[PDB]
C-alpha cells in the first residue's frame, strides 16, 4: 500500500463518468531500466482535485495507485505492475464529487 499498487477496489463508491471535463493524454514511458513514469493532463482545474492511476493486469486483478494532485507518478519493477507482459492503464480523478476517467491505454510498458 506504500508507494506500491493496492489490489483492493478503490474507496470511492461510484466510478460513473462525471462531466465533459476529463483527464487526457495518458502516456507511460521508461525513464530507466527500473524507473518508469506516466503523465496525464486534466482539462478542468480544481483546488481540491485528487488524481488516481488505476491499472489492470492480464490476469484481470485490476489495482489502483494512490497519488495526490500530480500529473506524474514514478514506479519500479515491483510496484505491482507487470513490466514485461501486456498491462492496461487508466486515470480516474474525484473532483466536484464526480469521478472522470482518462481513456484506457494498453502499453507493453517495457519501452
Amino acid at each position: 500500500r506504500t508507494s506500491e499498487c493496492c489490489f483492493q477496489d478503490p474507496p470511492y463508491p461510484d466510478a460513473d463518468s462525471g462531466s465533459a471535463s476529463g483527464p487526457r493524454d495518458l502516456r507511460c514511458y521508461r525513464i530507466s531500466s527500473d524507473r518508469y513514469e506516466c503523465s496525464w493532463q486534466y482539462e478542468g482545474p480544481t483546488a481540491g482535485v485528487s488524481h488516481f492511476l488505476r491499472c489492470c493486469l492480464s490476469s484481470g486483478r485490476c489495482c489502483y495507485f494512490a497519488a495526490g494532485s500530480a500529473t506524474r507518478l514514478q514506479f519500479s519493477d515491483q510496484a505491482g505492475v507487470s513490466v514485461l507482459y501486456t498491462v492496461t492503464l487508466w486515470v480516474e480523478s474525484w473532483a466536484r464529487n464526480q469521478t472522470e476517467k482518462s481513456p484506457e491505454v494498453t502499453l507493453q510498458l517495457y519501452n
Binding site: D34, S82, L84
Partner: protein, 303 residues
Amino acid sequence: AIWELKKDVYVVELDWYPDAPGEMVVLTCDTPEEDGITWTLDQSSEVLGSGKTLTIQVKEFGDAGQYTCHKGGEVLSHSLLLLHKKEDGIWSTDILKDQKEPKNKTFLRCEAKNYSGRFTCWWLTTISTDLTFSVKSSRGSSDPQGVTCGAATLSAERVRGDNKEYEYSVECQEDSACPAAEESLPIEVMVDAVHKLKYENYTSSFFIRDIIKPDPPKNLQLKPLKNSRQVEVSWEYPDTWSTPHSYFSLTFCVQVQGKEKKDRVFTDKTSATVICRKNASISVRAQDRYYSSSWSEWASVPC
C-alpha cells in the same frame, strides 16, 4: 536456473524480454510426510496448491515471494523466492550505483590505511528501505576463512541531486596469522545485495598496497629560524600507519599556496624550511614512498 542463496531462500535466474515464458519451478518441503499440505504465497488465505509439492513458473515478480508450507494449521516450512533478472544475457545491476571514478562498471570502492590488512569498502546505493547486503572475502581462493568481513552499516546520507544517495560500508581484516613481505594473490570481496524479491551480486578484486590511503601527518608545528625570513616546519609519522617506520616509508609533499599557484615541495625528511607569507597557510600531504598510492588529506597549520 534455481539455486539456494541460504536455507529456505532460492534465487531464480530469469531472462528479461517482453512476453517471456517462465522456467518450470518445483517447490519441495523437508518435513514428515503429511497428506493434504496446502500452499500460500500472499498473507491472505487464498490457497495456491495442495500436496507436498507445488509447481509455479515465476514469469513475473508477483509470482516470487514467501511461499508458505503449512498443514494441520501449523506452518511446516517456509519457501522465500528471490529473483536475479538477466537482461540481453547480462546480469542486472540496479541496487547499487556506478560511481565510475576509477573506470566504468565500478560499484565497489575499497581503501586501507595500514599494511596490517585491515580495509574498508564503500558502496553507494539509492534504495532507501528494504535493503540488505551479504559480504564475503578471501585472498585468492586458496585461503579458507582467509578474511573475516564484518557487517554492512549505513554510513552517510548525502543529498546528491535530490536522490539522497546512502553510503554503506564493511570492515574486513585479513585473518592470516603468517606475516608475508609481498602479496601474490588479490583480495576478492563479494556483496550479495538483496532488495525485496530482487537479488544482485558484485565482485571486486584488489591489492592492499594499491588501495592504501595514508592518514594526515601528525604533530605539524612551525618553528621560525632565529633572525631569518624562512621558517622551519617539523611533522611526525602517523601512529595508525604500520611499524616499523623504516621498512614502510612515506613521502611528504608540502604546499604553501594557502590563500605561487604551486608551492608543492616533495621532501622525504620530516622537517622542511619554507618562506612564510603572512597571508597564507602551509599544508602537508602523505603518500606511500615505495609505490603510487592515494594522497592523504592535507594537514594545515595557520602561518
